[PDB]
C-alpha cells in the first residue's frame, strides 16, 4: 500500500482499555491522616469523562496498601490483547514517589512495575497512563504577578 508512517499509537483495537480509578477518601485513624473532602467529585468526574472516551472504567474506594498492590497485580495479569491502552488514576494523600493506601504508603514504582514492558506482555508497545492527584512534597508556590 501507500507510505506508512507509524507516528501515533494504534488506538483502534476492539477496546480502548481499562481505566482503574483508586479513590481514597477515608483513612484509618491509626495513620493520623484526615479525609479528602471533595475527592468523590473527582472520582465521578473521571468516570464520566473516560466513559465517553470508551474506556472500561472500574472504580475502587478506600483501599489499603495491600489491596492497592493486589488490585494492580490482578489487573496487570489480565489479557489486554484486545485493548488499545491502559489508564490508572490515583486519588489520595502522597509524597514524592509515594501514594497512600488507607493504612500506609505504597511506592508508585511498585504499582507501575507490574506494567513494565516485560511483565505485562499484552500491553507491550501500548500506552500506559498513570494520572496522580497527590502531594509530591511540602513545598508551596508563592507564584508571581503577571
Amino acid at each position: 500500500s501507500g507510505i506508512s508512517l507509524d507516528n501515533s499509537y494504534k488506538m483502534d483495537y476492539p477496546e480502548m482499555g481499562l481505566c482503574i480509578i483508586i479513590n481514597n477518601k477515608n483513612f484509618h485513624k491509626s495513620t493520623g491522616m484526615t479525609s479528602r473532602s471533595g475527592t468523590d467529585v473527582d472520582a465521578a468526574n473521571l468516570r464520566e469523562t473516560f466513559r465517553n472516551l470508551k474506556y472500561e472504567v472500574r472504580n475502587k474506594n478506600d483501599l489499603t496498601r495491600e489491596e492497592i498492590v493486589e488490585l494492580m497485580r490482578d489487573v496487570s495479569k489480565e489479557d489486554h490483547s484486545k485493548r488499545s491502552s491502559f489508564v490508572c488514576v490515583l486519588l489520595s494523600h502522597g509524597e514524592e514517589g509515594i501514594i497512600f493506601g488507607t493504612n500506609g504508603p505504597v511506592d508508585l514504582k511498585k504499582i507501575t512495575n507490574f506494567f513494565r514492558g516485560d511483565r505485562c506482555r499484552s500491553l507491550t508497545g501500548k500506552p500506559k497512563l498513570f494520572i496522580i492527584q497527590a502531594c509530591r512534597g511540602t513545598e508551596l508556590d508563592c507564584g508571581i504577578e503577571t
Binding site: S37, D118, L140, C142, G143
Partner: protein, 103 residues
C-alpha cells in the same frame, strides 16, 4: 556509519518505555484540592478531555491542563502559610508515539 550500540538484529524496547505520568503538581510540591469542587488538577483534566479529546493529541491536551491550573487557581486559607499559593501540573512522558483518543 557503524557501531557497537545500534541496529541490533533482535529488536527490543526499554521495559520502561511507553509510560506517561500525569502529575497534578511539580516535584517536591503540595497538590491542592477544593473541599467542595474537587482537586484543581482533576477538575481541569476532565474539562480539557471533554473539550479536546476528539481534537488534540494527548500531550497538547495536558498542556492545556497545565495552563488552566496555573492561571485560574490560587489557594485560599485562613492560615497565612497556605494562603494565596499556586500550582503547576507536571507531565512526565516516556511515550514513543503520539496519542489520540480518537481514530
Amino acid at each position: 556509519a557503524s557501531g557497537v550500540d545500534d541496529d541490533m538484529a533482535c529488536h527490543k524496547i526499554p521495559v520502561e518505555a511507553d509510560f506517561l505520568y500525569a502529575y497534578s503538581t511539580a516535584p517536591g510540591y503540595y497538590s491542592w484540592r477544593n473541599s467542595k469542587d474537587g482537586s484543581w488538577f482533576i477538575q481541569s483534566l476532565c474539562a480539557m478531555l471533554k473539550q479536546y479529546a476528539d481534537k488534540l493529541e494527548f500531550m497538547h491536551i495536558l498542556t492545556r491542563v497545565n495552563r488552566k491550573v496555573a492561571t485560574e487557581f490560587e489557594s485560599f486559607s485562613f492560615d497565612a502559610t497556605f494562603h494565596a499559593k499556586k500550582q503547576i501540573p507536571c507531565i512526565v512522558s516516556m511515550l514513543t508515539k503520539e496519542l489520540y483518543f480518537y481514530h
